[PDB]
C-alpha cells in the first residue's frame, strides 16, 4: 500500500544521506528496489564454477544485456573493451586486470553456451541477445 | 460573533452568492488526501451540523449527525481524523485503547483536600457544542458501551452516584472509526456482520461509509502521482476531482463560525408525498433484506441550506440529501441485491 | 524442441520468409533485424501447428455448482441469512427474469451434453436424479461471462 | 591505452606505500598533540 510507497521515499533520503549527497538520485531508489523485494532471504548463496557468486553473476549478466540492447538501437572484443573500460574504476593491479578477463570470458561462453540467452551468429563472433529475455 | 470582522462577513457573504460554493467547500477539505469524495461530503455535511429542536418541551429532536468510517487499512482514516481535528474550533482526540467509560464520563471523586464528592467532567462534557473523535471504536468494551447510547440519543447524561443526582448537557459531534473483523471488508456480507458492533450502536449513526482496495492502475497512477507532488511541496527546504480551487483554511474556519452561529432554516417547502412514497419503498425493501432515518435526513437538508446560507430551504438540499443517504444505505447491503437496488431507484441516483 | 522431424518441418516453414528480404534486396544483422519479430511470433505455437442466451447461463451455473461446496451455497444467493435440482434452483436465483420451464431448456441440456461440454455420470436409465460434471477451463468461462456483463469471481468460494 | 594508465596509477601506489613504510605510531602520537591542551 502507500505506506510501502512511504518508505521507499524514507529509504532513498536514507541512500542520499549516507553519501553526504545533497540531493536524491536515482540510483539510491534502485538499490532499495532489491532490497524492498528480496524478503525471504537465505543464510548465504551458494558459489557458482575459481567460483563467483550469484548475485555478481546477475549483475554481470544485468550489465551486459542493458549494454547490447541499448546497442540495438556487437563484437565479442569491442564489449569486453567496453566491460574494461567501465570497470576501470575498480581494478588496481595487474593481476585483477587478468582475473577480470578470465572471468568476463567464461561468463560469455558460459551464457552463450548453458543458458541461450545469447546467440552466436557467423575469432570475433556476433553476439545477439535471446529475444525472450526482459 | 462580535469578534467577527465586516470584511471576514462580506468575504463569507460574496462566498455565498457563488453558484459553484459548495463545489469548493468540498474540495478545500483534506487537500493532502485524493478521491473518496463520499467521505469528506459526509464528514462536511455532519460539521456543518442540523438545528436541534425540543417540540412542546416534551421530546427534544437531536440536530446532531452521527457518522461512522469503516475502511480497508491503507486508506489514511486517521489523516482524516487528525485533519478534523485540527480544523475544529472545539476538537478532542481520544484512542480506542487509552479510552475507558469513567475517562469518557464524568464521575464523582472524593477532594483530596476538602473531601465533598466533586464532579470532574469527562471527554463527551468537554466536547459538549464542539466534536468528539473515536479512534478504532471497534475496540471498545461492551460495558464502556453501554454508556454511549444515553449521551448519543438525549446529548445529555444524568449521574447518580455517591447521592449526587446530576444531568449535563451532552451535544456534541461524534466521529468514531473502526477496521472490519479479520482487517478486510467481505462484500459477501451484510455490514452489520462485518462489524462488531450491536445493531442499536449503529442505528444510532446517522451516516455510514466504507471504504474498500481495489486494485486499479489509472487509480494507482493518480495515487502515485499526487502523493509524489505533495511530497515535493512539503518539503521543509523547499518551504481537483471537481476542477474549482480550494479555499483558505482561516476563511473556511470563519465560513464555518458564521453558518454555525447566524443561519436558521425553516422547512416549508417539503412535498411529504415524495418522502412519503419513498419511506414506503425503503420499508418495502428493508424487510425484503425508521423514523430516525427520516429525522436524520431532515436535520441533513437542514445542515445542506445551511451551507448555502439560505433561510429557507430549497427542494434541491432534500434532493441532495436522499442522493447521499440512497448512497450510503446500499453500500451496505449485499452484493446480490446492491445491483437491484441501484436499477429500482435509479431515479434518484441520476 | 529437440525432435528432428519437428525442427526440420519448421525451417521449411519459415524459409521462405528467411529468403524474402534478399530478393527484395550477407547481411546478417539487415537479416536478423527484418526476421525477428516472425520467429517469436512463430514460438507462440511450437507444437500447435457463440452459444445461445440461455445455453451460456447454463454454463455458468454449471461451471459455479462445479467448483463450488454445497454448503455456501445459500451463503451466495439466498436473499437473507452435482444433482439436476441444485442446478436449477441456481439457474432460477442468477436470470433476473422469470424463466418457463419449457422442454427446450432440457433439450439445451441434453445438447450440452452430446457437445461433451457437460458430462453425464450416472447411469443412462436413472434420468431422474442425474450426476453432471463441468470440464470447461476457466479462462473460457470468465471470458463467456464478460459478453454477459456477469462477474463470476465474485461468486467462486474457493478465490475469496 | 587503458595499460599505460593502470600501470602508472600502480607505481603511484607502490611509491606511496613505500612512503608509508614509515612507522604509523609517528602520526599517531602527532595526532594526539593537539589534543594535549
Ligand atoms: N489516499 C491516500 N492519499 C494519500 N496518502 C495516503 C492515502 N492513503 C494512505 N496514505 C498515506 O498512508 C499513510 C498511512 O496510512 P494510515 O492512515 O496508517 O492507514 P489507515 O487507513 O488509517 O489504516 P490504519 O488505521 O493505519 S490500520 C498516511 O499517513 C498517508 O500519508
Ligand atoms: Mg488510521
Redesign the interface.
Known amino acids: 500500500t502507500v505506506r510501502q510507497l512511504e518508505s521507499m521515499i524514507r529509504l532513498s533520503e536514507a541512500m542520499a544521506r549516507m553519501h553526504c549527497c545533497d540531493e536524491v538520485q536515482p540510483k539510491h531508489v534502485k538499490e532499495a528496489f532489491r532490497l524492498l523485494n528480496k524478503s525471504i532471504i537465505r543464510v548465504e548463496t551458494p558459489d557458482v564454477n575459481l567460483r563467483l557468486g550469484f548475485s555478481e553473476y546477475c549483475r554481470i549478466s544485468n550489465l551486459i544485456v542493458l549494454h547490447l540492447r541499448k546497442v540495438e538501437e556487437l563484437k565479442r572484443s569491442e564489449l569486453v573493451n567496453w566491460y574494461l573500460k567501465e570497470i576501470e574504476s575498480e581494478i588496481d593491479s595487474e593481476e585483477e586486470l587478468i582475473n577480470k578477463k578470465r572471468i568476463i570470458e567464461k561468463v560469455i561462453h558460459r551464457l552463450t553456451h548453458y543458458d541461450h540467452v545469447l546467440i552466436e551468429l557467423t575469432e570475433d563472433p556476433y553476439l545477439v541477445v535471446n529475444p525472450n529475455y526482459l | 460573533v462580535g469578534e467577527l470582522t465586516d470584511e471576514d462577513v462580506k468575504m463569507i457573504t460574496s462566498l455565498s452568492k457563488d453558484q459553484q460554493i459548495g463545489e469548493k467547500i468540498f474540495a478545500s477539505i483534506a487537500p493532502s488526501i485524493y478521491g473518496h469524495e463520499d467521505i469528506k461530503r459526509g464528514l462536511a455535511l455532519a460539521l456543518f451540523g442540523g438545528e436541534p429542536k425540543n417540540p412542546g418541551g416534551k421530546h427534544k429532536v437531536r440536530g446532531d449527525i452521527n457518522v461512522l468510517l469503516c475502511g480497508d487499512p491503507g486508506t489514511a482514516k486517521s489523516q482524516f481524523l487528525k485533519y478534523i481535528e485540527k480544523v475544529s474550533s472545539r476538537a478532542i482526540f481520544t484512542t480506542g485503547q487509552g479510552a475507558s467509560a469513567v475517562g469518557l464520563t464524568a464521575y464523582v471523586q472524593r477532594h483530596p483536600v476538602s473531601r465533598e464528592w466533586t464532579l470532574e467532567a469527562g471527554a463527551l462534557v468537554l466536547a459538549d457544542r464542539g466534536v468528539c473523535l473515536i479512534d478504532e471504536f471497534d475496540k471498545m468494551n461492551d460495558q464502556d458501551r453501554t454508556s454511549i447510547h444515553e449521551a448519543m440519543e438525549q446529548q445529555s447524561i444524568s449521574i447518580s452516584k455517591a447521592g449526587i443526582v446530576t444531568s449535563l448537557q451532552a451535544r456534541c459531534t461524534v466521529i468514531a472509526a473502526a477496521n472490519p473483523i479479520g482487517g478486510r471488508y467481505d462484500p459477501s456480507l451484510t455490514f452489520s456482520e462485518n462489524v462488531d458492533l450491536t445493531e442499536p450502536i449503529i442505528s444510532r449513526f446517522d451516516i455510514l461509509c466504507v471504504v474498500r482496495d481495489t486494485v486499479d492502475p489509472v487509480q494507482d497512477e493518480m495515487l502515485a502521482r499526487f502523493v509524489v507532488g505533495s511530497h515535493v511541496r512539503h518539503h521543509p527546504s523547499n518551504k481537483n476531482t471537481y476542477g474549482v480551487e480550494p479555499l483558505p483554511q482561516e476563511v473556511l474556519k470563519k465560513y464555518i463560525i458564521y453558518a454555525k452561529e447566524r443561519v436558521h432554516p425553516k422547512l416549508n417547502q417539503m412535498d411529504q408525498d415524495k418522502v412519503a412514497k419513498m419511506y414506503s419503498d425503503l420499508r418495502k425493501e428493508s424487510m425484503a433484506t425508521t423514523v430516525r432515518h427520516i429525522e436524520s435526513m431532515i436535520r441533513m437538508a437542514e445542515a445542506h441550506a445551511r451551507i448555502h446560507l439560505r433561510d429557507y430551504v430549497i427542494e434541491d438540499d432534500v434532493n441532495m440529501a436522499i442522493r447521499v443517504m440512497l448512497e450510503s444505505f446500499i453500500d451496505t447491503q449485499k452484493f446480490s441485491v446492491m445491483r437491484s437496488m441501484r436499477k429500482t431507484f435509479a431515479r434518484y441516483l441520476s | 524442441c529437440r525432435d528432428l522431424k519437428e525442427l526440420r518441418h519448421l525451417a521449411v516453414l519459415n524459409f521462405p520468409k528467411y529468403c524474402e528480404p534478399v530478393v527484395k534486396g550477407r547481411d546478417?544483422?539487415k537479416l536478423?533485424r527484418n526476421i525477428?519479430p516472425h520467429?517469436?511470433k512463430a514460438?507462440q505455437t511450437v507444437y500447435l501447428r457463440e452459444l445461445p442466451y440461455y445455453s451460456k447461463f447454463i454454463l455458468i451455473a454449471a461451471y459455479l455448482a462445479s467448483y463450488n461446496p454445497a454448503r455456501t451455497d445459500k451463503?451466495?444467493?439466498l436473499?437473507?441469512?452435482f444433482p439436476l435440482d441444485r442446478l436449477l434452483a441456481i439457474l432460477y436465483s442468477i436470470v433476473?427474469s422469470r424463466v418457463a420451464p419449457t422442454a427446450n431448456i432440457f433439450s439445451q441440456i441434453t445438447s450440452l451434453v452430446t457437445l461433451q461440454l457437460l458430462t453425464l455420470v450416472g447411469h443412462d436409465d436413472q434420468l431422474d436424479g442425474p450426476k453432471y460434471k463441468c470440464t470447461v477451463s476457466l479462462d473460457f468461462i470468465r471470458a463467456i461471462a464478460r459478453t454477459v456483463n456477469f462477474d463470476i469471481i465474485?461468486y467462486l468460494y474457493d478465490f475469496? | 591505452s587503458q595499460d599505460l594508465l593502470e600501470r602508472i596509477r600502480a607505481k603511484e601506489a607502490q611509491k606511496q606505500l613505500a612512503q608509508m613504510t614509515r612507522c604509523p605510531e609517528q602520526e599517531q602520537r602527532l595526532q594526539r598533540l593537539e589534543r594535549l591542551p
Open positions: 546478417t544483422r536478423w525477428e520467429l517469436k514460438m451463503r451466495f444467493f436473499k437473507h441469512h433476473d465474485k475469496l
